[PDB]
């Protein structure tokens, strides 16, 4: 596998990163604010109906989930 040699010394620098509240992913605090703008716009697959719904909408999606929608779009 790998010989037990001295080994390389891995070091880390002090970098303050910000985490999202919707996706909860690691991103640059600088590109965080913006990242959110799109983050929400993104649509995920629901389990009840099975349609693409906005991340931020998923909050109150359950309400319209089941009643709203053309019908059986996909399996
Ligand atoms: Zn995010
Ligand atoms: Zn749904």
Q: For residue 16, what is the enclosing H or E element?
A: none
Residue written as token pair 């996909």: 74
Distance 34 CA to ligand 2 centre (A): 27
Structure obtained using: NMR
Alpha-carbon gap, residue 44 to 53, rounded angstroms: 5
* List of residues 6+ apart from 53 with CB closer than 8 A: 43, 44, 46, 61, 65
Alpha-carbon gap, residue 36 to 18, rounded angstroms: 11
Residue written as token pair 């929400």: 40
Distance 8 CA to ligand 2 centre (A): 49
Distance 51 CA to ligand 2 centre (A): 6
* List of residues 6+ apart from 28 with CB closer than 8 A: 17, 18
Distance of CA 58 to the CA centre of its chain: 12
Alpha-carbon gap, residue 26 to 40, rounded angstroms: 15
Q: For residue 36, what is the enclosing H or E element?
A: helix 29-41
**DSSP letter, residue 58:** G
Residues β-bridged to residue 45: 52
Distance 66 CA to ligand 1 centre (A): 26
Q: Which domain holds residue 19?
A: 1-75
User: What total number of domains does the chain contain?
Assistant: 1
């Amino acid at each position: 596998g790998s010989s037990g040699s001295s080994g390389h010394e891995e070091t880390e620098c002090p970098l303050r990163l910000a985490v999202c509240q919707h996706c909860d992913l690691e991103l640059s605090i600088l590109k965080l604010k913006e990242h959110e703008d799109y983050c929400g716009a993104r649509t995920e697959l629901c389990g009840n109906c099975g349609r693409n719904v906005l991340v931020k909408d998923l909050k109150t999606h359950p309400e319209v989930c089941g009643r709203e929608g053309s019908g059986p779009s996909s399996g």
